[PDB]
Write a protein that binds this ligand. Structure first.
Ligand SMILES: *[C@@H]1O[C@H](CO)[C@@H](O[C@@H]2O[C@H](CO)[C@@H](O)[C@H](O)[C@H]2NC(C)=O)[C@H](O)[C@H]1NC(C)=O
Ligand SMILES: *[C@@H]1O[C@H](CO)[C@@H](O[C@@H]2O[C@H](CO)[C@@H](O)[C@H](O)[C@H]2NC(C)=O)[C@H](O)[C@H]1NC(C)=O
Ligand SMILES: *[C@@H]1O[C@H](CO)[C@@H](O[C@@H]2O[C@H](CO)[C@@H](O)[C@H](O)[C@H]2NC(C)=O)[C@H](O)[C@H]1NC(C)=O
Ligand SMILES: *[C@@H]1O[C@H](CO)[C@@H](O[C@@H]2O[C@H](CO)[C@@H](O)[C@H](O)[C@H]2NC(C)=O)[C@H](O)[C@H]1NC(C)=O
Ligand SMILES: *[C@@H]1O[C@H](CO)[C@@H](O[C@@H]2O[C@H](CO)[C@@H](O)[C@H](O)[C@H]2NC(C)=O)[C@H](O)[C@H]1NC(C)=O
Ligand SMILES: *[C@@H]1O[C@H](CO)[C@@H](O)[C@H](O)[C@H]1NC(C)=O
Lengths: 98, 597
């Protein structure tokens, strides 16, 4: 995920009015207003674009290099029989009290 | 919202964009410095101009947050570091004229040529040849010629430029509420509103003048010893009760006395430790040196090297054709990218320079978590002191014979210890009067206490009185001997070299008591002790977050700079010199001059 010259295709938000709620997603790109004056949809003084971006380069240190994250989350609402793991059965014998 | 939460939100965006742009510019600069071509010179200049334009725009944007309503001192430190106009408070005409005279003065210093009276087609620059005559020659007349001609041909060109530079710089500094340019320079040591760690700008002068009053009894005995030793190389040219002629001191200005060692060696039949044949005979290369340095640093409890340091650094001179400035520097490109650029041979001075530069690398690795603007030393004297104590500790016979470079027994004698202490005194002690006197002259000139028709008079009166050296030829007000030094004609402050020399020995004595050393101070090795490492790391990790009077206290235990550790370091040499000057005359008289006869 890193290119010499900069991989500017990975964004992240750093300005928001309030903290996110668990498992909430926000993809809006409206202009954050830091002061008390409206700016009506144009950056400038006290109004910032909310999305920054990682300029990934291969000559970075561990801690500034890209890491791929996958989060698995399990769900038990009410269903009787659902996705479950694999088992391995036993051989079937005959002519013996088993 | 007030006005303090908006400054924080501004500082966030600034930090993110500034870090990105600075990494780009530093990568361009490195790519040029390690591989000199023509397109690299422009690929680097574009990034430099982009960075400077971004910095200027953000600096004019940061003015809209008044510094009176900020209560956090970290936010206030960052804003005050970003709000300073510096230049650009002058008109356009005045700024252009100032940059013009700066470039002219630098060019005159760099390309000035002086040649022979008997062969006018043999002209010598300073760098290749004048400070090679002044370093190696033992001819009185040739040294006199090289000393006089450099100041009479190139120094006289710098006077009408320096006179205008002073005025323009004072005008720039007074528009920033600073009273003069010298106060602007002293403003690096200022601390405001910490309630116990404050520091004025006029307090630096008092501190410097009170610490210099205690180095005089050691410098006087060193001066008398060097004088009695020079009265054998140049008989019938030095007076046993007078000052020293300025052209016999070892280099063009007399900044270091280190080249007088062959003349003033105490016991010249005892060669001092130099493990260079053992390195070559044990098959050491440029990587073994840096592995040993990294091992020394990890011994006290400090981290390894970042694994991007071994792949990206340039530790040897690139062979085929890859023209590169071979000057040891530690690079801090940002974003976790630490590199060292140096072209090492297999010697002992390179073995010590490795430790010196890895000290800088460790200091940079320490404070890498601070905000972008708070990533530096506590003041201008901290980084080089931290780098210098490492080469102090790595060069002792105790350390060298634990590596394997000295024979396992190697009984030491006191004569070689005196040799070593004297060789160290010619570089460390011989430069403090020079530095103090030069910066004092510049301060008094910027302040206006020396009118422009008494510059050379006061220069040479102070050189006779404080330093104890006399000129061999009179100099009227058409000369400029200060401007003939690099730091004066190139607009650099000079007091960092004085405070660094004191912080260095304060740090070393503070770290030698945590390692539980017992002998004299010049024998201390802080390796294998994790308490000294922790004391040092407690200061390395701060950066410019806290006042320098606090960062100093975290290692030493005091708030102000002290000179007693230096005299403690040089005590044995002091006793030896005190016994060697029994029939000499300690001191000098400001009346004798080499021409007044
Ligand atoms: C040093 O810089 C020069 C010029 O910038 C490089 O020379 C060329 O670089 C391009 C870059 O892709 C190569 O495609 C060419 O093959 C290079 N030509 C030659 C004659 O070298 C040079 O590669 C740089 N050196 C290093 C070690 O990066
Ligand atoms: C404003 O000042 C407070 C303390 O006066 C700072 O709080 C510190 O914040 C850092 C990280 O943000 C923590 O590691 C410290 O433990 C905090 N200190 C205290 C005493 O709580 C705060 O960081 C300052 N504002 C900014 C933007 O840095
Ligand atoms: C930096 O320079 C500016 C002018 O170049 C100084 O003047 C102030 O600039 C701000 C921003 O435009 C104005 O709001 C003020 O009215 C100006 N005059 C003042 C404050 O008297 C500014 O003072 C300088 N700042 C510093 C810290 O030196
Ligand atoms: C730091 O401590 C280590 C560990 O004791 C020292 O290394 C040992 O030194 C002894 C004495 O010569 C040897 O017998 C061992 O073989 C060494 N062990 C290792 C793993 O190297 C080291 O010499 C000490 N360093 C300093 C500078 O005193
Ligand atoms: C190095 O140490 C030796 C021995 O400790 C010193 O030699 C003695 O010096 C004293 C002082 O004058 C004399 O009284 C003794 O007679 C000396 N010993 C002998 C065997 O003659 C020597 O002076 C010391 N050198 C330095 C430079 O300190
Ligand atoms: C440093 O690196 C060496 C490998 O050369 C490793 O064995 C050691 O554990 C490392 N030490 C630290 C403190 O990272």
């Amino acid at each position: 995920d890193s290119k010499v010259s900069g991989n500017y295709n990975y964004l992240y938000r750093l300005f928001r009015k309030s903290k996110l709620k668990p498992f909430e997603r926000d993809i809006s790109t409206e202009i954050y207003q830091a002061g008390n004056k409206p700016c009506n949809g144009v950056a400038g003084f006290n109004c910032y674009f909310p999305l920054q971006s990682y300029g990934f380069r291969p000559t970075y240190g561990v801690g500034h290099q890209p890491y791929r994250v996958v989060v698995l989350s399990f769900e038990l609402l009410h269903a009787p029989a659902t996705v479950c793991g694999p088992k391995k059965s036993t051989n079937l014998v005959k002519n013996k009290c088993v | 919202s007030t006005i303090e939460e908006q400054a924080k939100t501004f500082l966030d965006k600034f930090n993110h964009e500034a870090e990105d742009l600075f990494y780009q510019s530093s990568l361009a600069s490195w790519n040029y410095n390690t591989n000199i071509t023509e397109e690299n010179v422009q690929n680097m200049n574009n990034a430099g101009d982009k960075w400077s334009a971004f910095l200027k725009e953000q600096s004019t944007l940061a003015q809209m947050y008044p510094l009176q309503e900020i209560q956090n001192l970290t936010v206030k430190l960052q804003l005050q570091a970003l709000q300073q106009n510096g230049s650009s408070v002058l008109s356009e005409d005045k700024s252009k004229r100032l940059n013009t005279i700066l470039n002219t003065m630098s060019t005159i210093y760099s390309t000035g040529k002086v040649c022979n009276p008997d062969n006018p087609q043999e002209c010598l620059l300073l760098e290749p040849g004048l400070n090679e005559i002044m370093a190696n020659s033992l001819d009185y007349n040739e040294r006199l010629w090289a000393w006089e001609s450099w100041r009479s041909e190139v120094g006289k060109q710098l006077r009408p430029l320096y006179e205008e530079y002073v005025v323009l710089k004072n005008e720039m500094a007074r528009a920033n509420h600073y009273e003069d340019y010298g106060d602007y320079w002293r403003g690096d040591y200022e601390v405001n509103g910490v309630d116990g760690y404050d520091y004025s700008r006029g307090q630096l002068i008092e501190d410097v003048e009170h610490t210099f009053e205690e180095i005089k009894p050691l410098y006087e005995h060193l001066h008398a010893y060097v004088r009695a030793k020079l009265m054998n190389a140049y008989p019938s040219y030095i007076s046993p009760i007078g000052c020293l002629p300025a052209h016999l001191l070892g280099d063009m200005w007399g900044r270091f006395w280190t080249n007088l060692y062959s003349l003033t060696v105490p016991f010249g039949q005892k060669p001092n430790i130099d493990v260079t044949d053992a390195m070559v005979d044990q098959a050491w290369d440029a990587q073994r040196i840096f592995k040993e340095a990294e091992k020394f640093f990890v011994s006290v409890g400090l981290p390894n090297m970042t694994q991007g340091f071994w792949e990206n650094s340039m530790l040897t001179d690139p062979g085929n054709v890859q023209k590169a400035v071979c000057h040891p520097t530690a690079w801090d490109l940002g974003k976790g990218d630490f590199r060292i650029l140096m072209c090492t041979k297999v010697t002992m001075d390179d073995f010590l320079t490795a430790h010196h530069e890895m000290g800088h690398i460790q200091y940079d690795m320490a404070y890498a978590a601070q905000p972008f603007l708070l990533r530096n030393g506590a003041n201008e004297g901290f980084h080089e002191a931290v780098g210098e104590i490492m080469s102090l500790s790595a060069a002792t016979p105790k350390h060298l014979k634990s590596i394997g470079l000295l024979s396992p027994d190697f009984q030491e004698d006191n004569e070689t210890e005196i040799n070593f202490l004297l060789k160290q005194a010619l570089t460390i002690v011989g430069t403090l009067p020079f530095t103090y006197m030069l910066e004092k002259w510049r301060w008094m000139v910027f302040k206006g206490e020396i009118p422009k028709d008494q510059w050379m008079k006061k220069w040479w009166e102070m050189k006779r009185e404080i330093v104890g050296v006399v000129e061999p030829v009179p100099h009227d007000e058409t000369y400029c001997d200060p401007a003939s030094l690099f730091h004066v004609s190139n607009d650099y402050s000079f007091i960092r070299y004085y405070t660094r020399t004191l912080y260095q020995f304060q740090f070393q004595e503070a770290l030698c008591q945590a390692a539980k050393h017992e002998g004299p101070l010049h024998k201390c090795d802080i390796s294998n002790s994790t308490e000294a490492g922790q004391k040092l790391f407690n200061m390395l990790r701060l950066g410019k977050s806290e006042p320098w009077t606090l960062a100093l206290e975290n290692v030493v235990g005091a708030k102000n700079m002290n000179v007693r550790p230096l005299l403690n370091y040089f005590e044995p040499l002091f006793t030896w010199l005190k016994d060697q000057n029994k029939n000499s005359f300690v001191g000098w008289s400001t009346d004798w001059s080499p021409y007044a006869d």
